[PDB]
Amino acid sequence: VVRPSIWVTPSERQTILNKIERNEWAEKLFLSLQSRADAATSLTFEERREKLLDLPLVWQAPTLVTYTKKLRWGYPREPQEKMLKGIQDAVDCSVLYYLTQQDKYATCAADILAVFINALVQIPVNENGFMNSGWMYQDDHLLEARLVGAQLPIIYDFVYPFLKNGGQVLDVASNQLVDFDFSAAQKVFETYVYLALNRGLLESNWPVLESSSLLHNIHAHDDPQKVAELLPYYLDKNTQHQASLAMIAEMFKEPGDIWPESISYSKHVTSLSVYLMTLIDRKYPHYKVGSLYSNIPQSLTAMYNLQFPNDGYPYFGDTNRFMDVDFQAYEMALQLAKLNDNQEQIAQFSGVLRASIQNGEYERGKLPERDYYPSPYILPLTLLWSLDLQKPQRPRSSHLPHAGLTIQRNLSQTDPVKNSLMTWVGGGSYIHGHASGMDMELYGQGYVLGIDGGKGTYRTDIHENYYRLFAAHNTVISNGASGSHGGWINMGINQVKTVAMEPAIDTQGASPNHSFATTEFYDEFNLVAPAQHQRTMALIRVNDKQGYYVDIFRAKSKASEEFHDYVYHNIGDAMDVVSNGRKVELAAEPERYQDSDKIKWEKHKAYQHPGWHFFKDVQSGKVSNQNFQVTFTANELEPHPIIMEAFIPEDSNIQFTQVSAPPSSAAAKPYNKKSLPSFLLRRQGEAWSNPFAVVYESYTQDDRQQGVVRKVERLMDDKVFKGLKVTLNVNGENLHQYVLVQNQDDDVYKNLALDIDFTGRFAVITVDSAGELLNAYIGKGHSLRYQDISLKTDKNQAIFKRF
Ligand SMILES: [Ca+2]
Ligand SMILES: [Ca+2]
Ligand SMILES: [Fe+3]
Ligand SMILES: [Mg+2]
Ligand SMILES: [Mn+2]
Numbered sequence: 001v002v003r004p005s006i007w008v009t010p011s012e013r014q015t016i017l018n019k020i021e022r023n024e025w026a027e028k029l030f031l032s033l034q035s036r037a038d039a040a041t042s043l044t045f046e047e048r049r050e051k052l053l054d055l056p057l058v059w060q061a062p063t064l065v066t067y068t069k070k071l072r073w074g075y076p077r078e079p080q081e082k083m084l085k086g087i088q089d090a091v092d093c094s095v096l097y098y099l100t101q102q103d104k105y106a107t108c109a110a111d112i113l114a115v116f117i118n119a120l121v122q123i124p125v126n127e128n129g130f131m132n133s134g135w136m137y138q139d140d141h142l143l144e145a146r147l148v149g150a151q152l153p154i155i156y157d158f159v160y161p162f163l164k165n166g167g168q169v170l171d172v173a174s175n176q177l178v179d180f181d182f183s184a185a186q187k188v189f190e191t192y193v194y195l196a197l198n199r200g201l202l203e204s205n206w207p208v209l210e211s212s213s214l215l216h217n218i219h220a221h222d223d224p225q226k227v228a229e230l231l232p233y234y235l236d237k238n239t240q241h242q243a244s245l246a247m248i249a250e251m252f253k254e255p256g257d258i259w260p261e262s263i264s265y266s267k268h269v270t271s272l273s274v275y276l277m278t279l280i281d282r283k284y285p286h287y288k289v290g291s292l293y294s295n296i297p298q299s300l301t302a303m304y305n306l307q308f309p310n311d312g313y314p315y316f317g318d319t320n321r322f323m324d325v326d327f328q329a330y331e332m333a334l335q336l337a338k339l340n341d342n343q344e345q346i347a348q349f350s351g352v353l354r355a356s357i358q359n360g361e362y363e364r365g366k367l368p369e370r371d372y373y374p375s376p377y378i379l380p381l382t383l384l385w386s387l388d389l390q391k392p393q394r395p396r397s398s399h400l401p402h403a404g405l406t407i408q409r410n411l412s413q414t415d416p417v418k419n420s421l422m423t424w425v426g427g428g429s430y431i432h433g434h435a436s437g438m439d440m441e442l443y444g445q446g447y448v449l450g451i452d453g454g455k456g457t458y459r460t461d462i463h464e465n466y467y468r469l470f471a472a473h474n475t476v477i478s479n480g481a482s483g484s485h486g487g488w489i490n491m492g493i494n495q496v497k498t499v500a501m502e503p504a505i506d507t508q509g510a511s512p513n514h515s516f517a518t519t520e521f522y523d524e525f526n527l528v529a530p531a532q533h534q535r536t537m538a539l540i541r542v543n544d545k546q547g548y549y550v551d552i553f554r555a556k557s558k559a560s561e562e563f564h565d566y567v568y569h570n571i572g573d574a575m576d577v578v579s580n581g582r583k584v585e586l587a588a589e590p591e592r593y594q595d596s597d598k599i600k601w602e603k604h605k606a607y608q609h610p611g612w613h614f615f616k617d618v619q620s621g622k623v624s625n626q627n628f629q630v631t632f633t634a635n636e637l638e639p640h641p642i643i644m645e646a647f648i649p650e651d652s653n654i655q656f657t658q659v660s661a662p663p664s665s666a667a668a669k670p671y672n673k674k675s676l677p678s679f680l681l682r683r684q685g686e687a688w689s690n691p692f693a694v695v696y697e698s699y700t701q702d703d704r705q706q707g708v709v710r711k712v713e714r715l716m717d718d719k720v721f722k723g724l725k726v727t728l729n730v731n732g733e734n735l736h737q738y739v740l741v742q743n744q745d746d747d748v749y750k751n752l753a754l755d756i757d758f759t760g761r762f763a764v765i766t767v768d769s770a771g772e773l774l775n776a777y778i779g780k781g782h783s784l785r786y787q788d789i790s791l792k793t794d795k796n797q798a799i800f801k802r803f
Helices: 010-022 024-040 045-053 077-100 103-120 141-149 152-164 182-198 211-219 224-230 245-252 263-283 295-304 327-339 343-358 381-385 461-467 594-598
Strands: 169-171 176-178 397-400 405-410 421-426 439-444 447-450 476-478 497-502 514-523 531-541 547-557 563-569 574-579 616-624 628-634 642-648 654-661 676-684 687-700 709-716 721-730 733-741 748-751 756-768 773-786 789-792 799-802
Touching: 010 024, 010 077, 010 381, 024 077, 024 103, 024 381, 045 103, 045 169, 077 103, 077 141, 077 152, 103 152, 103 169, 103 182, 141 152, 141 182, 141 211, 152 182, 152 211, 182 211, 211 224, 211 263, 245 263, 245 295, 263 295, 263 327, 263 381, 295 327, 295 343, 327 343, 327 381, 405 497, 405 514, 405 531, 421 531, 421 547, 439 642, 439 687, 447 628, 447 642, 476 531, 476 547, 497 756, 497 773, 514 756, 514 773, 531 733, 531 756, 547 563, 547 721, 563 687, 574 654, 574 676, 642 709, 676 687, 687 709, 687 721, 721 748, 789 799
Parallel strands: none
Antiparallel strands: 169 176, 397 405, 405 421, 421 439, 439 447, 476 563, 497 514, 514 531, 531 547, 547 687, 563 676, 574 628, 616 654, 628 642, 642 687, 654 676, 709 721, 721 733, 733 756, 748 756, 756 773, 773 789, 773 799
C-alpha cells in the first residue's frame, strides 16, 4: 500500500496545493490548521519529550489512563482532555507533514502515535462479554471508537512515509530515539476492527457511530488482501454487532426519508454516513455508493424542506428548534454528488453552499475551533477535500412518513420571515418520539407561536408524565385518557395518515392563496375507549401581509359515553379571553385534571396519561354555545408585541378552560423558561358531527392593519357542521370567506340563504360586502354553485377561479 491512502494520496497533493494558491478560503484554512500544528511542534529535544509527558501516561513503555464505569462522558475529565488534545494535535501535524513535507510535523505526530500504540498493546481487551466493552475504555467501546479508534489509523497513514524511510520516534521511557513498532501498530488496527465487528448494538445508530473506526482501521492494515477481505464488513456484510452501509440504507428507503428519530438525533446519522460514503467513492470509483444509496445524501434536502421561514425546525419529539447548518456535510455531499453524476444533488448542495457564502452564514475560510465532541475528528477535510466552486426554494407541501408529518407552507413575497404562513401536522412511533397524538405547530411573525410543549430532562417525573404525553401537544385528548403502548419504551402511537390534501406533495397548487390537508389518527391505546381522530387544517392567504389558519378536529370514541378535550399551547406572557365580545368569568378549578396523578408511574414503562395534572392556574367557564376569542401576547420577543388570536365560533358546545402549562423548550428565548399559556375546550359527548373548530391569525402590534379576521361562525345544517363563515376586514372593507368542509368526497351541501351548492370535501368561497363572488377554490371536490355561477373540477379534483 502506498501511503497516505485514506484521506488523500500523494498524487492529489499538488491539486490541493494548487487550490490553496488559487483560493483565499483555502489559504486561510491552511494557515489556521498550520497554526495549530505549529503549537504542537518542538524546537529542542527536551521539548519533544515534554509534549509526550503532557499525555496521561501511566508509568517498559508507559500505558495510558484507562477508563472504568470534573467528569466528562462519565469519566475523569482531565486525562481525557490531555489525551484528545494529543490525538488531534497529531492529526493536524500529520496533515501539515503531507502538505509541507517538513519533518518537524512528522516527528511530532509519530511520537504521539507511538505512545498510543505502545500503551494499547499492553492493556488487556475487556473479555467480560458485555457488548459495549472496549479497550482503553474498558466499559465503552462506542465512545473509544469515536475518540481514539478513528484517529490513530489516520495519523499512521500520514506519518508512514517518514517512518518507513528511517524516521524515528522519541521513546518517552528511555529518552532515546527508536524505531516505530510497526507490528504493534498492526495489532492495534486489527483490534479496533475486531471490536467494531464484535461490540455494540446492531439495530441502532451505533454501527454508524462505530464505522469511522472500522473503515479507517481496515485501511491501516499492511496487507491489501486483508484490506479487501475486511471492506465488505462496512459495505454490505453484517454481523451480530454491526450493520453495514447496505443495511443502514434500509432506513432511507424512499427519497425524502431520514434516519427515523427526531430531527436533532437524525442529523448526526446523515453527517457521518455522507462522510463515509464520500471516503468510499473517493477511493473505490466502481462501487458508486453515492448512487446506490442516494437517499442518504438526499436526507440533507429532506431536512432542509422541513424548515420554517425563520430556519427553525418542526419540534417533534426530543429535539431542538435551531441547529447550525451542517456545512461540512454539504461540502462532502457535494463532492459525493459530483463523483456520482447526480445533477439534482449537485445543484441543490452547491446552491445551499453558494447562498450561505453570499449571505455570510458560511465563512468558508474559517476553520472551526476544536470542540472536543465525541465524534470522529475530520476537521482537516474542510481544506483537503472541499471543491473549488467555479437559496433553493421549499415546496408548498412536504411529507415525512416515519413521523406521520405533513407540512403546508405559504410564503410571502415581501418580508417572508414575518409574513409567511406554515403549519405541520404529525404523529407516529419512533425512537425519541412522543405520545403526541395528531399534533401540530403554527408559524407567525418570525416565530413558531403555536408550539409543542417541549422536553424535560430525561428520566424525570415531568418528562415522562407530562412532556412526552398528549397534554403537552396541540391535539385532542379523548375520554381523558389518550395514551401510548409498545414501540419504544411504551411510547408507541399509530401513524397519522393522509386522507386528502391540495396541493399534493412537491407540486404547485390550483391556487397560490389556498391549501388544505386532512389527516386521520387512530387513538388505539386510550385507557378508557379507543377513539378515531380526524383533522383538517387550511392555510388561507388574504394578501402578501395577511393570512390565517383554519383548524377542524373531529373525534369519536367507540363507546356509549365519551368526552373530548382540544388543547392549544401558545408562546406568551399574557393571555386574554372574551365571549360574545365581553370579558369571561372564569372560576378556579385547581383539581380539574388531578385524576391522572393517581396512575402509578413506572419509569421507562408506565405513564400518567394524558399528563394534564401538571397544568397550573386552572380556570374554567361554563358549558357554552357563545363564541370565544383568545388573545395571546408575547412582549419579549421583539420590540413590539407579537399577538396570536384564536377565534372559536358560537355553537361549539364547549367548556373553555385556561391553564399555564410547564415551560416549553420549543419556545423562543426567553420563553423556554417561562410558563406556557394554553387552553382546553371540553366537549361532552361525540365531537364528530359538530367538531372542534378554531381560526388562528397572528400579527405584530406595530402593524397598520393588525388582524384581518373579525368574526368566525359555523355553517350548520341541522346540528351537522358544514364549515365556517369568516368575516374579514381589509383596508377598511368587509369581505366574507365561506370555508366549506364535508366529511365525504361525494357529500352534497345546499345552503338556501347563501344560494350555495357544493359537492365535495373542501372549498373556499370569497365574496365582497355586497355578495359578489370574487374567487372560488375547490381543494378537493366535484362541483360548486354560488348564485348563478357554476364551477367544475379538473384533474386532481381541484380548481381555482377568479371573477
Ligand atoms: Ca459494532
Ligand atoms: Ca375533518
Ligand atoms: Fe421560533
Ligand atoms: Mg364561559
Ligand atoms: Mn413533544
